[PDB]
Structure formats: C-alpha cells, structure tokens
C-alpha cells in the first residue's frame, strides 16, 4: 500500500543522518 512504503523510505532516511 501506498501508506506502508511512506515509512519503509523512513528506513535509510534516518540511517543517512548518522
């Protein structure tokens, strides 16, 4: 769903910050 993906981009998004 199109509201399950919005969180699993979250996934390397914090990683990239630290």
Same mark, same amino acid.
């Given at each position: 769903?199109?509201?399950? !993906? ?10 990239? !910050?630290?």
């Amino acid at each position: 769903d199109p509201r399950i !993906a919005a969180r699993g981009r979250a996934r390397l998004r914090a990683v990239g !910050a630290i």
